[PDB]
């Protein structure tokens, strides 16, 4: 009742993964694995967290954006106006030249824009962590977008929530 799943073991109905490299082909992926348009810049595989294939691993080898995206622009439910995007993430290879985590993006337009440097130390054990991202410090297209040139991580259990799980780490707003 607290939450709206976006990717909890499988994509919620109106959702896709989007793998967007520097090529002229953008890939909308709804299964266990995918490649970006150039077949190399951004790859998705399944990984196992709590069940077989409940996570997705993503490997960046060149400039590319991964999004978890709505099939059509969807206004943020007012239920979540002071809520959180929650997800589990494991960063197995930190980005040498950095990465951007954007949350709840419209056409022009993200609710949060977080550099990986801002939470890199808490992720540096290369273990899974539950991250709670407060949405506030118009129709939404990308629930999340991660952009980098070189990076390896995995994501699971992505949901909008009004209250962060107990063992969550809040990516609070920069001062
Ligand atoms: Cl990088
Ligand atoms: Cl960074």
UniProtKB/TrEMBL annotation:
Q: Which UniProt keywords apply?
A: Calcium, Hydrolase, Metal-binding, Signal
Q: Which domain of life is it from?
A: Bacteria
For biological process, the GO terms are: glucan catabolic process
Disulfide cross-links: 105-110, 137-173
All copies of the ExoP galactose-binding-like domain together span 19-159
| GO-annotated molecular function | beta-glucosidase activity; metal ion binding
The entry's protein name is: Exo-1,3/1,4-beta-glucanase
Task: Name its species.
Answer: Pseudoalteromonas sp. BB1
Q: Which gene encodes it?
A: exoP
Section of the entire sequence shown: 659 to 840 of 840
